[PDB]
Amino acid sequence: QGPKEPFRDYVDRFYKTLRAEQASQEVKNWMTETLLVQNANPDCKTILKALGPAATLEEMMTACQGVGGPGHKARVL
Amino acid sequence: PIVQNLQGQMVHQAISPRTLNAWVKVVEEKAFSPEVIPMFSALSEGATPQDLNTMLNTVGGHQAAMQMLKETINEEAAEWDRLHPVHAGPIEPGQMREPRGSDIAGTTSTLQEQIGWMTHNPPIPVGEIYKRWIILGLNKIVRMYSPTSILDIRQGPKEPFRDYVDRFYKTLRAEQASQEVKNWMTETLLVQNANPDCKTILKALGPAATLEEMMTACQGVGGPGHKARVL
Amino acid sequence: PIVQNLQGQMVHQAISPRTLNAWVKVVEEKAFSPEVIPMFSALSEGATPQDLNTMLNTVGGHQAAMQMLKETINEEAAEWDRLHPVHAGPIEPGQMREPRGSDIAGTTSTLQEQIGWMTHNPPIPVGEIYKRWIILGLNKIVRMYSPTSILDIRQGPKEPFRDYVDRFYKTLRAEQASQEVKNWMTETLLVQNANPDCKTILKALGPAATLEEMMTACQGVGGPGHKARVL
Amino acid sequence: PIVQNLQGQMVHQAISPRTLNAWVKVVEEKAFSPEVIPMFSALSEGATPQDLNTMLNTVGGHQAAMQMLKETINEEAAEWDRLHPVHAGPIEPGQMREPRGSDIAGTTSTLQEQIGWMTHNPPIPVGEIYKRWIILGLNKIVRMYSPTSILDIRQGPKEPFRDYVDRFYKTLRAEQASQEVKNWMTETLLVQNANPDCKTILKALGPAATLEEMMTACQGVGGPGHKARVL
Amino acid sequence: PIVQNLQGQMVHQAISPRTLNAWVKVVEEKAFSPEVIPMFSALSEGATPQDLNTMLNTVGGHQAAMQMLKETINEEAAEWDRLHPVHAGPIEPGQMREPRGSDIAGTTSTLQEQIGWMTHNPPIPVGEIYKRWIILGLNKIVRMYSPTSILDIRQGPKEPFRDYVDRFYKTLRAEQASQEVKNWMTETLLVQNANPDCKTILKALGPAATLEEMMTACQGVGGPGHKARVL
Amino acid sequence: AEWDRLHPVHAGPIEPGQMREPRGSDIAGTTSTLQEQIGWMTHNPPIPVGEIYKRWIILGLNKIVRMYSPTSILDIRQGPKEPFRDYVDRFYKTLRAEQASQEVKNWMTETLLVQNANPDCKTILKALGPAATLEEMMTACQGVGGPGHKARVL
């Protein structure tokens, strides 16, 4: 996750990259658990770890507001 | 007030100066504030229409508000008789007569008629119904003389969270909106109308974030600037 | 004062200093407002003529008003003894002698006689009759020495509609105003002292000048630019 | 509430509205200061769970504080059922049923049952148990609404030592320090956060000086900015 | 407090918060001015040791003053234990046992027993003994919370003689010096530290004059038609 | 001297064949002999006179450390570009140096610690609050953090 990049754009980018990767689903799930929170923004991953592992992506998307400046509730240009 | 030493054997004890004096003192300060309604409810547990009328008769201030309350009661009494919803007909020998709204508000009913309805099976709660009409009128007065909307309650630039919360909760209490709306207001609106410095911390609270946790979170984020141990 | 117990008999005791202490403070502030009449009524629940005389002579304040009240009760008592010439002694065996006007105002009756009438079955309401005479004297003080004119019952040049309705209804209550006078004032004068927004909603408002609807509609002073009479 | 009898167990009496009216005023002016806890302790002498609920129910001010207190007591009631905490009187009553958290909270118990526990031999002290939960809420309200500031209590230049000590003790009470914390704060900060003219006397007075010695020694000299009067 | 004296039914109830709030105002707002000792002496009429403990607890959050007061009380109770070699339990079955220092302060004795001592024939005056110990400690608090020296106080430039005398007499009550010294302060010091015009008449009148003569003349001097000089 | 004021020793031994009760002077070593000092430890039960003296000595050593170490928990605050991890180490070093009691350390940890942190830095720490232990806290505050984002060659 980039220094100016909000959590939604990073997740969008990760899943776009995950489509380009052609690995088996078990490996993809294990990679998602391994990488997605870990390689994220430091304050944002700290918020997400306190949500905990059984948080849904919808809950995670609704969280982390005010990280990545204006543009994180509005469309990419 | 009504006293029962045996259940169904109602005795009326006449309302006393200390009760009236305390009630007037509550009315003098608290009528336009949501403070009056729960104290009025606590006083009105086991009340007759005669007790409720005596309570309204012992107020002499705030006449426009009193007229709006009286007009509200007259319209509730009219709507009740349009419904006619507590009924039993006239055919049967020796059975209680059907309540009118005028009977409920204690003008066309005697104390023995009022006792008869409340000692009936089902107990027909003429004092509770009249008290609810008065509570609706008090809430109408509280709404009418309310200073500003719950949506417009907002925390100043570096304002204490606790002062903002007290104003928000008073305004929320005096608001009459649905329980889900009130839950959304505590969850969302209270956090949203907080000042930016407080609000980032409030938005970063975990699952199951309590008002006590919010108070802890915003403690040291507002009020007077730091004047020691900061340089 | 008199208290009725659960098993159906009446007991007496000397007047509370809480009532006297509250009463002096009520007389200090409420004297020229019609607030005094309900608050006096609240404080005098079950009061004997002796208790009422104790309350009247307790007051050292507002002496000319007290002189007006004392003359008013003495005139009413004299007029009551004009109405009924009272027969000598009891008028049947084993029953109390009939009240005179001076017995009612406590002067020629002793405390046991006052208790005797008030503990009659049904009660002979000497305290109520005297209390009504005291209330008439209070009404004279309230009308005579009023701040508020019923002849200047039009809204001021700088006066908001919410303050105006408080003054208007208080003035009517102070006068004990006629149902006809209220009927003319509500439909004519009150509407014409209401702000243009109140006159705008006239079809929704309908007949007979609904107060909460007008209070909802009106914002600030009525007359043009908040600097002139509305009427 | 209950009142004592000279022979045998107590008798229940109806609550005074003056007591409720005073309680509403105490909540208005003193709720966020820990001096409310002694007033509440005095108020709740001989109080049933039903009386305690009536006292809480009566309040309509400071609803944010009341909500956290109500959640706090509900957690304590759940804790009573779930954790089995230690208590005064029998774990097994002889002539009454065992009290659940809901029974102690007054929800699933009758007023006669509440009287039953309190009149039992030994007494089962349900009001004393419940009011401790309420006191934990009141102590929490003081912690939430009074800024944490014990290390920041310090004497102004023209300030009396006694007011500074009084403020320090009040702040320490608001914070709710345990014995090790309370002694450490009291020993280490009290001379150190004094003003230098006052501190000079305290340093001269020396190691191990008692509070009465310090209070006596460290009195002012009445110079400019210090009062010569209270009244 | 004891609330019935001619009957044993309903003999005792808890002290009102309404009364306690007035007591809290005397300690907090009049800042331990000499009036607190006569006010406490008035409040303690027919009081139990528990009522006295309730008053000690309810000092308006003045915890620091309470610590010094309670520690003083503990010594007074300890001195009583030296004075009277009281045993546990009664001399003989059924007898009211002699009260120890612990019992008198309500530490080892419960409310029913305290009422039992006070309602015996002869009564055993446990609350009266405890009240004196509390007053002895309260006198120290009155000295400690005294604003300034008896020597430093003065009459203002246009100030009434009665205001100066009231201040001097209150300060004199707070001062702990010998009765011989206190008489010297009344006869010589008060006149000596009085302003020149007031001093000149008070010296002219001298010790042979009555208090009324001193008051009338020095009120005469200080009224309108006065220079207002302190030299 | 506190021990002596608190404990006058009346009479000799209780009976022959068991040690006398020690006064404060005996503990400090100025009235007791080496044979007495051995005698107390070789008693049944042993009387731990040296341990009693040592507890007083440790308190004096603590005063010496506090006298020569300018450490104070009252003055503490986070430095401007100071890591949160450096700041907590400095805070617990300060508590160690001043020898704070455990309940005081808990109050300092749960009340004071995040209060005297930088306002940008304290953001997520304030949101976590005193329910989160030190390990739980130390995963935070790396957004305003120093080096540690990019891997090193070691």
3-state secondary structure E120-169: CCCCCCHHHHHHHHHHHHHHHHHHHCCCCCCCCCCCCCCCCHHHHHHHHH
Collapse the DSSP code of E60 into the 3-class scheme (helix H, G, I; strand E, B; otherwise coil) and give the result: coil
For the record, the structure tokens of D94 come out as 């002889």
A41:F143 CB<8 A: yes
Residue C45's CB is within 10 A of a number of other CB atoms, namely: 22
The size of the B-C interface in CB pairs under 8 A is 75
Please check whether residue C155 is in contact with residue C164, taking contact to mean a CB–CB distance below 8 angstroms: yes
For the record, the structure tokens of A20 come out as 């380009």
**Which is it for the CA torsion F18, F24, F28, F32, positive or negative?**
negative
Q: Look-up: residue for tokens 């949203």?
A: B192
Within an 8 Å CB–CB cutoff, is residue E149 touching chain D?
Answer: yes
Distance CA A45, CA A51 (A): 10
For the record, the structure tokens of E88 come out as 């546990």
Residues β-bridged to residue D12: D2
For the record, the structure tokens of B201 come out as 């911390």
Query: Up-side HSE of residue A43: CA atoms within 13 Å toward CB?
Result: 29
Please check whether residue D72 is in contact with residue D137, taking contact to mean a CB–CB distance below 8 angstroms: yes
D148:F115 CB<8 A: yes
B18:D16 CB<8 A: yes
Within an 8 Å CB–CB cutoff, is residue F123 touching chain A?
Answer: yes
Three-state SS letters, chain D: CEEECCCCCCEECCCCHHHHHHHHHHHHHHCCCCCHHHHHHHHCCCCCHHHHHHHHHHCCCCHHHHHHHHHHHHHHHHHHHHHCCCCCCCCCCCCCCCCCHHHHCCCCCCHHHHHHHHHCCCCCCHHHHHHHHHHHHHHHHHHHHCCCCHHHCCCCCCCCHHHHHHHHHHHHHHHCCCHHHHHHHHHHHCCCCCCHHHHHHHHHHCCCCCHHHHHHHCCCCCCCCCCCCCC
Q: Which of E92, E98, E128, E131 is nearest to E113 (CA)?
A: E98
Distance CA E99, CA E124 (A): 9
Strands B10-12 and B2-4: antiparallel
D17:B23 CB<8 A: yes
Sort out which chain A residues have CB atoms less than 8 A from B199's CB and list them: 66
Distance CA F5, CA F23 (A): 10
Distance CA B214, CA B187 (A): 11
Q: Look-up: residue for tokens 């009247």?
A: C56
Q: What is residue E185's DSSP assignment?
A: I
For the record, the structure tokens of D66 come out as 């009341």
Query: Up-side HSE of residue B67: CA atoms within 13 Å toward CB?
Result: 19
- Chain B contact partners (≥3 CB pairs within 8 A): A, C, D, F
The DSSP H or E segment spanning C2 is strand C2-4
Residues β-bridged to residue E2: E12
Distance CA F49, CA F35 (A): 13
B38:D60 CB<8 A: yes
CA E101 → CA E75, E80, E106, E115, distances in Å? 10, 6, 9, 17
Q: What is residue C221's DSSP assignment?
A: B
Residue E6's CB is within 10 A of a number of other CB atoms, namely: 4
Residue F29's CB is within 10 A of a number of other CB atoms, namely: 14
Collapse the DSSP code of A51 into the 3-class scheme (helix H, G, I; strand E, B; otherwise coil) and give the result: helix
* Touch between D and B (at least 3 CB pairs under 8 Å): yes
For the record, the structure tokens of B16 come out as 């006393």
In terms of phi and psi (left: phi > 0; alpha: psi -120 to 50; beta: otherwise), the region of B25 is: alpha
Instruction: Pinpoint the alpha helices (H) of chain B.
Output: 17-30, 36-43, 49-57, 63-83, 101-104, 111-118, 126-144, 161-174, 179-184, 190-192, 196-203, 211-218
Q: Where are the strands (E) in A1-67, listed by range?
A: none
Q: What is residue B152's DSSP assignment?
A: G
Within an 8 Å CB–CB cutoff, is residue A11 touching chain B?
Answer: no
Q: What is residue F21's DSSP assignment?
A: P
CA E79 → CA B179, E72, E100, E108, distances in Å? 63, 11, 11, 17
Q: Which of F59, F47, F45 is nearest to F23 (CA)?
A: F47
Q: What is residue F111's DSSP assignment?
A: I
Collapse the DSSP code of B29 into the 3-class scheme (helix H, G, I; strand E, B; otherwise coil) and give the result: helix
Between CA C44 and CA B126, with CA B67 as vertex, the angle to 5 degrees is: 70
Please check whether residue B16 is in contact with residue C45, taking contact to mean a CB–CB distance below 8 angstroms: yes
For the record, the structure tokens of A1 come out as 């996750």
Q: Look-up: residue for tokens 């009661």?
A: B73
Q: Which are the contacts of D178, defined by CB distance < 8 A and separation ≥ 6? A: F103
Query: Chain B window 201-220: which residues touch F at a Cβ cutoff of 8 Å?
Result: 201-202, 204-206, 213, 216-218, 220
First to last CA, chain A: 18
Cβ-count burial of D7 within 10 angstroms (0-12 exposed, 13-18 middle, 19+ buried)?
exposed
Collapse the DSSP code of C12 into the 3-class scheme (helix H, G, I; strand E, B; otherwise coil) and give the result: strand
Q: Which long-range contacts (CB under 8 A, 24 or more apart) does D183-192 make?
A: D184/F101, D184/F104, D185/D150, D189/D150, D189/D151, D189/D153, D190/D165, D190/D214
Cβ-count burial of E127 within 10 angstroms (0-12 exposed, 13-18 middle, 19+ buried)?
buried
Q: Which are the contacts of F9, defined by CB distance < 8 A and separation ≥ 6? A: F20, F21, F22, F23
For the record, the structure tokens of E124 come out as 């055993």
Q: Look-up: residue for tokens 């107990």?
A: B123
Q: Which of C134, C145, C152 is nearest to C54 (CA)?
A: C134
Amino acid, res. C140: K
B204:A47 CB<8 A: yes
Q: Which are the contacts of A40, defined by CB distance < 8 A and separation ≥ 6? A: A1, A7, A10, A48
Please check whether residue E148 is in contact with residue D222, taking contact to mean a CB–CB distance below 8 angstroms: yes
For the record, the structure tokens of B127 come out as 């004092």
Q: Which of A65, A72, A73 is best to mutate for the B interface (most B CBs within 10 A)?
A: A65
Please check whether residue E108 is in contact with residue E139, taking contact to mean a CB–CB distance below 8 angstroms: no
Amino acid, res. D158: K
Amino acid, res. C226: H
Residue F55's CB is within 10 A of a number of other CB atoms, namely: 8
Q: Distance from D146 to chain B by nearest Cα, in Å?
A: 9
Buried b (16+ CB within 10 A) or exposed e, E37-49: bebbeebbeebbb
Sort out which chain A residues have CB atoms less than 8 A from F145's CB and list them: 42
For the record, the structure tokens of D113 come out as 């049952």
Q: Which are the contacts of B125, defined by CB distance < 8 A and separation ≥ 6? A: B118
Buried b (16+ CB within 10 A) or exposed e, B134-169: bbbbbbbbbebbbeeebeebebeeebbbbebbbbbb
Strands B10-12 and C2-4: unpaired
Cβ-count burial of B82 within 10 angstroms (0-12 exposed, 13-18 middle, 19+ buried)?
exposed
C215:B24 CB<8 A: no
Percent helix, percent strand, percent coil in chain F, to nearest 5: 50, 0, 50
Residue C35's CB is within 10 A of a number of other CB atoms, namely: 23
Distance CA A36, CA A64 (A): 14
For the record, the structure tokens of D183 come out as 């002694």
Q: Look-up: residue for tokens 């003098």?
A: B28
Q: Look-up: residue for tokens 């007065």?
A: B141
Q: Distance from C8 to chain B by nearest Cα, in Å?
A: 10
Residues β-bridged to residue D3: D11
- Chain C contact partners (≥3 CB pairs within 8 A): B
Helical packing angle, E49-57 and E63-83, nearest 10°: 150
Collapse the DSSP code of E93 into the 3-class scheme (helix H, G, I; strand E, B; otherwise coil) and give the result: coil
Torsion of CA F28, F30, F34, F38, to 10 degrees: -30
Distance CA B203, CA E173 (A): 60
D60:B43 CB<8 A: no
Residues β-bridged to residue C10: C4
Distance CA C30, CA C142 (A): 9
Strands D2-3 and D11-12: antiparallel
Distance CA C139, CA B88 (A): 46
Q: Which of C53, C45, C99, C44 is nearest to C73 (CA)?
A: C53
Q: Which of B140, B145, B74, B105 is nearest to C208 (CA)?
A: B74
Of B201, B213, B230, nearest to F123 by CB-CB distance is B201
For the record, the structure tokens of F19 come out as 């040690």
Distance CA B117, CA D163 (A): 62
Distance CA D144, CA B212 (A): 7
Distance CA A7, CA E184 (A): 85
For the record, the structure tokens of D195 come out as 């003003």
Residue C47's CB is within 10 A of a number of other CB atoms, namely: 24
Amino acid, res. B177: A
Residue D32's CB is within 10 A of a number of other CB atoms, namely: 19
Q: Which of F114, F120, F121, F124 is best to mutate for the A interface (most A CBs within 10 A)?
A: F124
Q: Look-up: residue for tokens 């401790």?
A: D132
F127:B216 CB<8 A: no
Collapse the DSSP code of B2 into the 3-class scheme (helix H, G, I; strand E, B; otherwise coil) and give the result: strand
First to last CA, chain B: 65
Q: Look-up: residue for tokens 């006292």?
A: D55
Distance CA E68, CA B183 (A): 49
Q: Look-up: residue for tokens 């007495």?
A: F36
Between CA C169 and CA C177, with CA C172 as vertex, the angle to 5 degrees is: 145
For the record, the structure tokens of A66 come out as 């005010």
Torsion of CA E117, E123, E126, E131, to 10 degrees: 140
Amino acid, res. F117: A
**Backbone phi and psi for residue C3, each to the nearest 5 degrees, phi listed first:** -125, 130
Percent helix, percent strand, percent coil in chain A, to nearest 5: 55, 0, 45
The alpha carbon of residue E129 and the mean position of all alpha carbons in its chain are separated, in whole angstroms, by: 15
For the record, the structure tokens of C19 come out as 């009532």
Q: What is residue B93's DSSP assignment?
A: T
Buried b (16+ CB within 10 A) or exposed e, C5-24: eeeeeeebeebeeebbebbe
Collapse the DSSP code of C160 into the 3-class scheme (helix H, G, I; strand E, B; otherwise coil) and give the result: strand
Please check whether residue D73 is in contact with residue D94, taking contact to mean a CB–CB distance below 8 angstroms: no
Within an 8 Å CB–CB cutoff, is residue F138 touching chain A?
Answer: no
Distance CA E206, CA D123 (A): 69
Collapse the DSSP code of F55 into the 3-class scheme (helix H, G, I; strand E, B; otherwise coil) and give the result: helix
Between CA C81 and CA C90, with CA C87 as vertex, the angle to 5 degrees is: 125
Between CA C159 and CA C163, with CA C161 as vertex, the angle to 5 degrees is: 65
Buried b (16+ CB within 10 A) or exposed e, D15-25: bbbbbbbbbbb
Distance CA E227, CA E216 (A): 18
The DSSP H or E segment spanning E97 is none
Distance CA E33, CA E143 (A): 9
The DSSP H or E segment spanning C10 is strand C10-12
For the record, the structure tokens of E68 come out as 């010094």
Q: Which of C148, C177, C176 is nearest to C163 (CA)?
A: C148
Q: What is residue E221's DSSP assignment?
A: H
Q: Which are the contacts of C45, defined by CB distance < 8 A and separation ≥ 6? A: B14, B15, B16, B17, B20, C1
**Backbone phi and psi for residue D98, each to the nearest 5 degrees, phi listed first:** -65, 135
